[PDB]
C-alpha cells in the first residue's frame, strides 16, 4: 500500500551538541523491511546516514561512526536518529526512506553559533 | 453485570451458617468432618461456566476479610491426621493472590511442618498443591522455602506414582521456575532438578503431565549459565515433537474438563508467559506460543478475549509472525491471531521489477557501493536489468575488475532478491512454492519467470535447462529443485 | 558407546523403565533407549545398530509382558528382535521383574528358551536405594 512518512526535529545547534529526530509511518514498523536516513547538503548529491533492518542490524558510513545512532520504536510508530557530537560541515536537509522507493519530505538542519 | 452478583446471591448465603459450624464452639473430633460443608460449595461455585472466576475469589475472600483463615492454622495442631487430610484440601481452593499474602506473612513454618511427612499418599496431594500455589507469592518466599526442604519433597515425589500428585508436582516446579527469577534457577540444577523431570515428560498416560513438564524444562533452558546442564538431562528431545504431535484444540477440550484447570488462569500468570516468545531458544518460543494459543482457545469460548490486549500479548504475536523462519511457531501464532479475530500481517517488500534508474541509484547508495552510481547511470540499468546482471557485464562494462568486489556485490544482490515483491509478475505464485522448500531458494523466482515458466509447467524441465537458462549455478540447488519437481510426476 | 540398553513394552512398563533410566544416569552410565518408534524398526540395519552398540542389556518387563512375542516364532516382534540379536551376539540379559510371573516354557517360543536361565531382581517401590545398589553390580559393562 501507500506508506506516507512524516519527520520532525531539526533547526540550529551549537557545534559539539546533540539532536534527536523522528519519522512516523502510516503502518507498523515491524512489518516493513528496511528504513534509512539520507543527508542532502546543498550543492551536492544525496548520501546515506544510517539504515536499519527488520531484525535490528544497523549500518553507517565510516564518516559518522559513533556520532549517530538509529533505533526502531514499536510502541508508537517512529524510527529515531540520534545526533550527539556535531560538526559545521554536517548541515543539510534530512530524508526518511521506507524500503527503497517511499520518500519523505525532509527537514532542515543547520549548525552554527 | 447483574448475573455475576446473582451468583453471589446463590453462593454467599450458604456461608451464613457454613461459617458457623466450623465456628461451631463445642465441636467433636467426628464433627470436624463438617469441614466439607464449605468444600462442595467452593468446588460448585468454582465451576460455573464463564462466571466461575469472578465468584470464586469473591466467595473465598470472606474467610480472610472477616477471619475464617485463622482456624485452618489453629486446627493443624491435631495429632491424628484425618483432619489434616480433610482440611488442607479446603485450604487449597481458597488460596488466591489476595489470600497468599496472609500465609506468606504468618504460616510459612505451619506449611512445612507437614511437608516433611511425605509417606501418606492421601495427604501428599494437598501438600503438593499448597506448595504449588505458594510459589506464586514472591521471590523471597521461594528463596525461604528452597533454603528449607520445600524443594526436596517435590523433587522426591517424582519417585511416587500417584497421578494427581504428579500433576501438582509439575505445576509446582513450573511456578518455582517462572516466579523465582534467576537466582533460584541455579539452585534448581544445583540440587539436580532438571534430571528428575524425565519420568514426567516420558509419561504415556496423561498429556497434562507432558505439557507441564516441557514448560518447566523450557523455562530452565532460558538460564544460559546452566544451559548445558539441562541439555544433557535428555528431555529437550521430547519437547520438539510433542508440540508437533499435539494440537491446542484438543488441548482446550481436555482443559475445560478437569476441575482445577477448568476456568483457566489470570492476568498475572500470563504476563509472565509472553517473554517466552522473543527468547533465544526455539523450544521456549514454541511452548510459549502453544499455551498462549491454547489459552486463547480456552477463553474465547467466553467473551473474555479482551484480556490479551492489555497484557501486551497481541503486539508480540503480531510482530513475531512476519519475517520468521519457523513454520511451527508462526503456525501457532497465526492460529492464535485468527482465533482472536485480529488480522494477520504480511510483510511489505520492495517491488524490484518495477524499479527505475533513480531507485537503483538509491539502493546503490544504501549498500555502500556508492562509487559506481555513475557507471550504472551511464548504462541506464533499471530493476529488470539489475535482476539479470551476470559476471561479464560487471567485469567488462560496469568496471568491477576486482573479483572480491564482485563477490561482495553479489552477496548483497542475492540478499535483496529473496526479499522482493514479485506479485506484479508472478501468476502461479512460484515464489511461495520456492520458499516452502527453503527460504534461500526464493531468490531464483525471477529467473524462472523471465523465461516464463510457472508451477503448472514446472514439471517438464531438465537440469541442463535450469543451468543455462534460469541462472542457477550451484549444483545442489539444481538437484534439490529437480527432485522436488519430479516427485509430482504428471501429477495433474 | 552406550553401556546399557533398556528394552520395554511400548504401552506398559514405561514409567518405571524411566525410573531405572534416571536412577542409572544418577550413577554415570551411558544408556540408550527407544522413543516413539511404533514398529518402525523394519529397517534391516537399525535393529542391528541398536543391539551392536549395546554392551549390557536390561529387559525391564511389565505385568503382562512378552504377550506379543509369545505364540509368534517369527522375527516380526521388536522385543523378539532384541533378544535374538542379544543372544546371537552373546550378551547378558539381566532382567528386572515387577508384578509378572515366569510363563510356561512350552507356550514360549522354542528358540528363546535360553533366556530362562538368567537371574532377575524383584523390584521394590519403597527401598529404591537397595535395588539400585544391587543392580549396579553384575552388569559387566
Ligand atoms: N482454573 C484455575 O486456575 C483454578 C480452578 C480451580 C481451583 N483453583 C484454585 O484456586 C486458586 C486460584 O488461583 P489463581 O489466583 O492463580 O487463579 C488456586 O490456589 C487454585 O488452587 C484454580
Author numbering:
A (entry chain C): 1 to 113
B (entry chain A): 58 to 549
C (entry chain B): 561 to 701
Verbatim from the authors:
Sterile alpha (SAM) and Toll/interleukin-1 receptor (TIR) motif containing 1 (SARM1) is an autoinhibitory NAD-consuming enzyme that is activated by the accumulation of nicotinamide mononucleotide (NMN) during axonal injury. SARM1 is a multidomain protein composed of an N-terminal 27-aa mitochondrial localization signal, an Armadillo repeat motif (ARM) domain, a SAM domain, and a C-terminal TIR domain. Truncation studies suggest that TIR is the catalytic NADase domain, while ARM serves an autoinhibitory function. Here, we generate a nanobody, Nb-C6, that specifically recognizes NMN-activated SARM1.
Further focused 3D classification around the ARM and TIR domains was performed on symmetry-expanded datasets, generating three major conformations, named Class 1, Class 2 and Class 3. The final resolution of Class 1 and Class 2 was 3.7 Å and 3.8 Å, respectively; while the local resolution was 3.6-4.2 Å for Class 1 or 3.6-4.5 Å for Class 2. The ARM-TIR domains in Class 2 rotated approximately 5° clockwise compared with those in Class 1 as revealed via the superposition of the SAM domains, but the ARM domains in both classes were almost identical, with a root mean square deviation (RMSD) value of 1.06 for all main-chain atoms of V61-E400, indicating that the ARM-TIR domains moved as a whole. The NMN binding modes in the two conformational classes of ARM domains are almost identical and only the mode in Class 2 will be discussed due to its clearer density and better model-map fit. NMN directly interacted with seven residues including W103, R110, E149, Q150, R157, H190, K193, S316, and G321. The pyridine ring of NMN packed against the indole ring of residue W103, forming a parallel π-π stack, while the amide group formed hydrogen bonds with the main-chain carboxyl group of G321. The ribose part of NMN also formed hydrogen bonds with the main-chain carboxyl group of residue E149. The phosphate group formed salt-bridges with the side chains of R110, R157, and K193. The NMN-binding site, in fact, was the same as that for NAD as observed in inactive SARM1NAD, accounting for the two ligands being competitive. The NMN-loaded ARM domain exhibits a significant inward bending as compared to ARMNAD.
